[PDB]
Design a protein around this ligand. Sequence first.
Ligand SMILES: NC(=O)c1ccc[n+]([C@@H]2C[C@H](COP(=O)(O)OP(=O)(O)OC[C@H]3O[C@@H](n4cnc5c(N)ncnc54)[C@H](O)[C@@H]3O)[C@@H](O)[C@H]2O)c1
Lengths: 200, 232, 230
Amino acid sequence: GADKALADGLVKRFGADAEKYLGRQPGGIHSDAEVMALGLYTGIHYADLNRALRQGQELDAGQKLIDQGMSAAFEKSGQAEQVVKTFRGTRGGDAFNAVEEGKVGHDDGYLSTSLNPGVARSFGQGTISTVFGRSGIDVSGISNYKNAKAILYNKETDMRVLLSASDEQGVTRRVLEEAALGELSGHSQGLLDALDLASK
Amino acid sequence: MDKSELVQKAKLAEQAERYDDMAAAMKAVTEQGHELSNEERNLLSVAYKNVVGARRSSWRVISSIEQKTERNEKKQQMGKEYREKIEAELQDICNDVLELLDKYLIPNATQPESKVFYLKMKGDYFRYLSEVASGDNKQTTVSNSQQAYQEAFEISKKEMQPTHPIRLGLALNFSVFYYEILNSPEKACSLAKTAFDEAIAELDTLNEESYKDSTLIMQLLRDNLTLWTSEN
Amino acid sequence: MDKSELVQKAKLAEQAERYDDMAAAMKAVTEQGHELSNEERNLLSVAYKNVVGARRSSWRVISSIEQKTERNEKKQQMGKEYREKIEAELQDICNDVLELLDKYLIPNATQPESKVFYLKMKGDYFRYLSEVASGDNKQTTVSNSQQAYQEAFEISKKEMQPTHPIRLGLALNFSVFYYEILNSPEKACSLAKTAFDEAIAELDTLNEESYKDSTLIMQLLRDNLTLWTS
Ligand SMILES: NC(=O)c1ccc[n+]([C@@H]2C[C@H](COP(=O)(O)OP(=O)(O)OC[C@H]3O[C@@H](n4cnc5c(N)ncnc54)[C@H](O)[C@@H]3O)[C@@H](O)[C@H]2O)c1
């Protein structure tokens, strides 16, 4: 419906660029418009869209379609049954530089993460993060350069900084958690207390 | 008595904040000779942690009194007699858990994770003995603490991830042993630094079940390092 | 052992947060037969307050578990056996202090202030017995609690100022007895209202050394009336 309009808008706007993602996810959780929107983003449109989103710029006609196809894909998908561990590397800047440990923050653009740690270091060595979440979308079947096996988190998705540390090499090592998981998440029941830690 | 009965009594005792009951329940479960589950190990551990922990606190209070009131000889004889009553309770609690460790816990430990846990525990209770011991007995309790912590350290470094909460918890307690019991800021800082450095190098090894357990012990490791090395 | 020796052990045990040791030290001081000073009375009181208070808390926790976890009949038995172990401990505590009260504390209390304190205390420990008792045994303790509280109430109303912290504290504990043990919001509100009204009518009777003691108990009795008639 509103999807049929979007799927029509996307091939009108991006032609063969949009169409090449049709049927790339034969599982069928997402519609043609959603599959094409995430494809377009993951393949190359991440750069211009995330730049417009992080700068608070007006999205051009074509950017609006990709963003509305992705937002719709995240409304559909929702939270998964299991918590997933993904990885992310950035070069010069990171959304969570401004967030102190225990506090929550977000990226204004979309957060790309990888199921492979080695794949993340290949994107950046400024800051390497370990993410734990449930509301991410697996796009490895739509677009998968470097066999990145990407799990994308929605824009403005709130993440809690569990650890923010630095390497003797000067790499910041972060542990982020989807703030919606709660306080109980990531704790093996009774373990920390059993560990009889030498601290008041 | 039945295993699941004593375990439920221990879970009850925990809620009622009756840790001497909780420890006695888990002492019997252990004396049955059968390997404890992860739940039963943690119940035995939190039970004795609180049983011993209360006496450690009470000992640190009466000892702090003895210093600030070094006056009347009958008043000091009251303070000493009371410190020694608490010391005797400490030594009795520790011996009981060190007895459960050597006779039942360490020999029945199949997987390396539970072995490092019980060996770190043996290092802990020998360290608790060291805090109250003096002379020749101190030398022995200290050497036994270091040995049990080192044994656990070598097994963990070979069969566990640098982010494992049991490996990190061992690193924290062993470094604190060097700082408090051997008064070595250098050896303490070296253990904490290496353990933290090896854990941030391999954050990919974090478990989706115990990642917040790991990040918390990594914050205590780092926080100690900045405390031990930072000038005002 | 010597009086000043046991008192120092009790002051030590208190700092070490070892109240069972603190109570046992003060039990021996009481069992000698000589009247306790204001310092020794307060040491015996805070010792048993914590000794009993811990068992009351543990009892309220295991009882709250028994209700919310009704499935395995073997689990319910474990809960009952444990509640009854704590009940046994609670019963033994109150008996030991009620024994110290009738045999040593109440007979040696010369001044009325001390007699009110020990009689309010007798009402308190009989009320603690009532919380765990059932049937015929419950009826005996509730009647003994009310009697001991009423005895102190009549002595306090005649020989003490309406703002005396021991008189006000008695009013708070007696009103709470009516509310919790006799489930009478009307009798509880009447005791609290009259006690508060008589205290604000005679604020001139406040002592310049213990006025904050009185105003605090006058706030706890004021917060209860607004809570109960809401
Ligand atoms: N980085 C990864 O680890 C990673 C992992 C898996 C897949 N991918 C894919 C790789 C590719 C692009 O993603 P990615 O490089 O992560 O995009 P990005 O837009 O998020 O990052 C590009 C660069 O911009 C910088 N930057 C990032 N966020 C901010 C911010 N909030 N504020 C200021 N500067 C910032 C930083 O320098 C980063 O390296 C898509 O094909 C993704 O599917 C990336």
